[PDB]
Design a protein around this ligand. Structure first.
Ligand SMILES: Nc1ncnc2c1ncn2[C@@H]1O[C@H](CSCC[C@H](N)C(=O)O)[C@@H](O)[C@H]1O
Ligand SMILES: Nc1ncnc2c1ncn2[C@@H]1O[C@H](CSCC[C@H](N)C(=O)O)[C@@H](O)[C@H]1O
Lengths: 246, 244
DNA sequence: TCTAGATCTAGA
DNA sequence: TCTAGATCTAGA
């Protein structure tokens, strides 16, 4: 098992065995909600179309893909004892919010992800990252994970777009894996988009493109995914894998 | 630290360490602007005189002090999923505004404080509470905080009166802590702000220490010119100590 | 994920 | 002068 280099709310590392068990085979895997990329990192498709609405995330991935050595070098300098304190963390959070440079923002993004509170990635309505200091003994610098990501990324394309747009990219040889923000147990993922996601999936399988969706197992998701074969993963509420197979 | 059971604009929980560092010792603590009472709840004076101009607040505190179990039981019934929606919130707001019963108003006051917009407590000129719905996922019911408040309240007296009147209650064994509405970065006027400092000067002349907290501005530096000023840490906070 | 809470704004 | 809605902010 390969770990993602980012800590991420909704990370699927623990559910990889269950996901892979139900994920059909194909030439290409499309992930409309790539997040930290645990599925991408633990599968063997010949190519990937990885997308997410988070622009900082997609920019970061392209930089890791194309400028690996420069990135690892710059990022590694921030993972020292000297940056592990509140005064430094908040100055870097401010530096990040004021910068318009893709490379520096990407470098700081990793620092904030691992020195910040519980690995949260959160912004206010003005687009400013506002996660507080996480007070860790020693954040782990994901050097091996970054190199592995960059290697796998040579067969991927990253897109910053909403799910309806990346899913429209799927074709005959694609398999689509959707891991939308969790459903209930502004400027976020709504219940209407949750329902709409299921609708697009029904449209794709009608065209012989398989789709697997992961979400909590609730009365609502049961309803949204009524046209899929449901698989429960016992784990609080259980996890659900809705498979739309041609 | 102990949390107040009400959410409250101007709450001093984050500033408790700083306040206590400069608050003198004595038998009795007088708080002319008690608000949610975080200082009262995190100090250990033998007795307290707690006052505020808000009548609903003082009425509520007396009910919590004297009828703790009945109050908690009644209040707890409103902290359920079924009351967490706009339709119910606005009907309870109207119920509160039409009621003249101290107990029911006290019970609804807590509901409105935690289901309403950002813990605001606001009324129009007709005396009607007009804070909108706050749309929280699950407002916290402060059961532990209510019991602690009631316990501490056994050594307090609550008064609904303006600051000049409660400060006149201080005597030889009193320490006065004032947390007036914040100074600009009826309502609380700049004249009352200045008047407050004047009373403090009169109290310390009589050997009664007074600590006042406010924002650190050029106006407050002027009002509290006769005090020993301490700056804490958005503008900085100022603690003005009038020590005999 | 939980939680307190220093405002802003249009306008019969 | 006032009324009354606001679907957030940011630390832990
Ligand atoms: N409308 C939208 N379109 C595409 N992605 C979206 C979206 N709304 C939210 N997201 C993205 O949804 C992702 C859910 S987390 C997915 C995590 C991933 N399976 C892993 O294992 O790491 C987040 O990264 C979020 O940025
Ligand atoms: N003239 C006046 N006399 C007494 N209290 C007044 C007043 N004008 C306003 N107030 C009260 O001033 C309080 C300021 S908030 C004080 C908060 C308190 N220290 C805490 O930690 O919770 C409010 O509760 C308000 O009702």
């Amino acid at each position: 098992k390969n770990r993602a280099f980012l800590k991420w709310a909704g990370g699927k590392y623990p559910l990889l065995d269950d996901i892979k068990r139900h994920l059909p085979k194909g030439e290409c895997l499309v992930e409309p909600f790539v997040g930290a990329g645990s599925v991408f990192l633990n599968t063997d498709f010949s190519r990937y179309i990885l997308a997410d609405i988070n622009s900082d995330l997609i920019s970061l991935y392209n930089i890791v893909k194309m400028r690996t050595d420069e990135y690892v070098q710059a990022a590694r300098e921030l993972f020292v004892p000297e940056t592990n304190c509140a005064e430094v963390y908040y100055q870097f959070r401010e530096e990040f919010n004021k910068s318009q440079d893709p490379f520096r923002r990407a470098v700081l993004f990793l620092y904030l992800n691992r020195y910040g509170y519980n690995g949260l990635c959160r912004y206010n309505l003005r687009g400013e990252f506002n996660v507080p200091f996480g007070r860790y003994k020693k954040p782990y610098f994901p050097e091996a994970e970054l190199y592995h990501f960059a290697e796998k990324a040579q067969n991927a394309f990253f897109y910053c777009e909403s799910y309806a747009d990346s899913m429209a990219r799927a074709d005959d040889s694609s398999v689509v894996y959707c891991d939308p923000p969790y459903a209930p147990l502004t400027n976020s993922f709504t219940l209407e988009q949750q329902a709409h996601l299921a609708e697009i999936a029904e449209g794709l399988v009608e065209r012989h493109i398989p789709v697997l969706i992961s979400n909590h197992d609730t009365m609502l998701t049961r309803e949204w995914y009524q046209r899929a074969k449901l698989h429960v993963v016992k784990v609080k509420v259980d996890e659900l894998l809705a498979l739309y197979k041609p």
